[PDB]
C-alpha cells in the first residue's frame, strides 16, 4: 500500500571485526494490513541471494508494520563495495522500490590518530576528559573505541565524522575518566578501526607522560 | 590405494583478520594416477551439504600425484572448533578415512605483550633488533607482526610458540631495523592477533625513549 | 612390522660441556618381537667401535620390540664433524639400516648474546621475565642456561633456534623471576654454550641497572 524504505548500512565495527557479523538492513515503513509479510529479495549486484532472514510482521502501537530484513553480508564483499538493492518482491504491491547501498566510493585515506591529554583547567574538575583526535580518513565508516589495561572502556562519547577541508573526515573521541585513575600511571589507548589502516586497526596510547 | 594424509590448520592471521580468508588444507601425497578425483563430502557431524571449493591436483616431478583441497572457513565458525568439508576418500580406496581437525580446546588466556628495546651492546652494531615478548596466551594460534608509523615492517622473524611453566604459551618477534632509524626517534609497534585479546588485537609501541 | 630406526644426536650442552657425556643414541622401533637378533656395528668413520652399550629392549603394547643402543664418544670427536653410522642388522629387515649421524657442517658463526631487562609494563606483575637474545649463530646446536649468583636459575624456557634472514639462527631465553628479586638488585646472567664461541662459552649479565 505504498510503503517507505529506510536504508541502514552495517556498523564499521561489525564490518572490520570478525567476532561480530555485519548486517545490511532495509526497514519498511507503513505497509498495508492486507500484506503483513513483505517478501524481500536481496539483489547483490542484480544476483538473487538465498538465506537473509527477515523479522516476521512486527507491528507498532499504531496500525502499521515495521518489517525488518537483514542479510549476513560478508566482510570482504562490503570492503570491495558490493551494491545491495533490497528489491521489494511482495505479492500484491505497486511498482518495486530500489534503494542501492554499498561502501562509500572513493580512494580510502589512512586516518591519523592523536591522543590529547586533558587541559590543566580540567584537573580542577573531578573527571578529566581524554581526547582522541582521528583525522585524515576519507570514508566515514570508522569505529573508535577506548580501552585500558587490555579491557574496554565504556565511558566515552565520539563525535560524528566531520568533513575536513582536504575532503577527508575527522572526528573526536572523549573518554571521561575520574582524576584518580588519570593521575596515577594508568594507560588509556583509543583504538580506531578503519578500512584504510594496516590490519584495519591502530592504537594510540595516553598515559599522562604525553607532553612531558 | 590409500595414500598418506597430512592436515594443515588455517593460519592464525587469517582467522582474526578481515582481509585474509581462512582455509583448511588437506594436502595428500602419492595419490593414484588412475583415479584422480577424491571425494570431498564431510559435514561437521557427518555428511549433509555440498559446500566445498574444489581445486585442481598438483603433479610432482615424478609419478606421485598430489591432491590439494582448500575451502573458505568462516571466522566465527573456526573459533568454536568445528569440522569442515575436507576429507580423503579416493575412488580406488575402498575404506575412507576421516582426519579430524579443529581449533585447540581449553580456556583462552589473554597474551601480555612487552616491547623490549635493544641492548646497549647492540648499539655498536649496524642493525639493532627490537623484540616483542608476547607471553600468557593458552591457544598457540597467534599472529605477531611489526609496523612503523602505518606501514608494515617486514624485516622481522618470530619464534614458534613455547609452552610455559603454567600451561600458557609465549614467543618473541625480532624486528631488525637499521641503527639510524632507531636513533632518529622512529616509533615501531609490534601488533599481535590473539582470540583472547580485546578486539582480537593489541599494539605495543617502541622507540628510543621507552623506559629511558 | 617394518623396523623404524630413529637416531638421537647428543645434547648440545652435553657435547659442549665437560661435566656431561655425549649420547650418540640409536633407537630402532617397530621391530618384530619374534626377532631377538640385533647388531651394534657403529661405523664411526668406517670403523666399528666396541664401546656401544647394549640394553634390554623395550616392549610396547603390540608384539614388537624397541632396542635402544647408546654410544658414548669424546666431545672433540663430535665437534670435528665425524660420521656415526650405525649398522642395524636383523632377520626382520634383510637390508641393514645405517643411520648417518654427524654434526651439522658449515661455517660456524659466533652467537651475539644480548640481555634485555623487563619492560616497564612487566613491573606491575609479581613475576618479571628476563630475556636473553642469542642471535647470529649458524649451527643450531646451542645451550642456553640462566644463573644468578653461581647457582642455576632453573625457572627458564628457551625458544627453539629460529633461522634468521642471513642464514644464521637466533633464539630467546625467558627467565621468570620474582619482582622482589629483580628490584632488590640481584644480578642474573644467561650462560650460552656454542661451538663457535671462545672456550665454547659466553655469558651476559642482567641486573636492575638503568642506563644513564
Curated annotation (Swiss-Prot), chains A, B, C:
Changing residue 87 to A: Impaired ability to activate the classical complement pathway. It is found in: Secreted; Cell membrane. Residues 1-206 are annotated as: Constant (C) domain. Changing residue 200 to R: Enhanced ability to activate the classical complement pathway. It comes from the Eukaryota. Glycans are attached at residue 62. Changing residue 65 to D/A: Enhanced ability to activate the classical complement pathway. Changing residue 94 to A: Impaired ability to activate the classical complement pathway. Disulfide bonds join 26-86, 132-190. Changing residue 92 to K: Impaired ability to activate the classical complement pathway. Residues 3-102, 111-206 form the Ig-like domain. Changing residue 96 to A: Impaired ability to activate the classical complement pathway. Immunoglobulins are composed of two identical heavy chains and two identical light chains; disulfide-linked. Immunoglobulins, also known as antibodies, are membrane-bound or secreted glycoproteins produced by B lymphocytes. In the recognition phase of humoral immunity, the membrane-bound immunoglobulins serve as receptors which, upon binding of a specific antigen, trigger the clonal expansion and differentiation of B lymphocytes into immunoglobulins-secreting plasma cells. Secreted immunoglobulins mediate the effector phase of humoral immunity, which results in the elimination of bound antigens. This is Immunoglobulin gamma-1 heavy chain. It comes from Homo sapiens.
Amino acid at each position: 500500500g505504498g510503503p517507505s524504505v529506510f536504508l541502514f548500512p552495517p556498523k564499521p565495527k561489525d564490518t572490520l571485526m570478525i567476532s561480530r557479523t555485519p548486517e545490511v538492513t532495509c526497514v519498511v515503513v507503513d505497509v498495508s494490513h492486507e500484506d503483513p509479510e513483505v517478501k524481500f529479495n536481496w539483489y547483490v549486484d542484480g544476483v538473487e541471494v538465498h538465506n537473509a532472514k527477515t523479522k516476521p510482521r512486527e507491528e507498532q502501537y499504531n496500525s502499521t508494520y515495521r518489517v525488518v530484513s537483514v542479510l549476513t553480508v560478508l566482510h570482504q564483499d562490503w570492503l570491495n563495495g558490493k551494491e545491495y538493492k533490497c528489491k521489494v518482491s511482495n505479492k500484491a504491491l505497486p511498482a518495486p522500490i530500489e534503494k542501492t547501498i554499498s561502501k562509500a566510493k572513493g580512494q580510502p585515506r589512512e586516518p591519523q590518530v592523536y591522543t590529547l591529554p586533558p587541559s590543566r583547567d580540567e584537573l580542577t574538575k573531578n573527571q578529566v576528559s581524554l581526547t582522541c583526535l582521528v583525522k585524515g580518513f576519507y570514508p566515514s565508516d570508522i569505529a573508535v573505541e577506548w580501552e585500558s589495561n587490555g579491557q574496554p572502556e565504556n565511558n566515552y562519547k565520539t563525535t560524528p565524522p566531520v568533513l575536513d577541508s582536504d575532503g577527508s573526515f575527522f572526528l573526536y573521541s572523549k573518554l571521561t575518566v575520574d582524576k584518580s585513575r588519570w593521575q596515577q600511571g594508568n594507560v588509556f589507548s583509543c583504538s580506531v578501526m578503519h578500512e584504510a589502516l594496516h590490519n584495519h586497526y591502530t592504537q594510540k596510547s595516553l598515559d599522562k607522560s604525553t607532553g612531558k
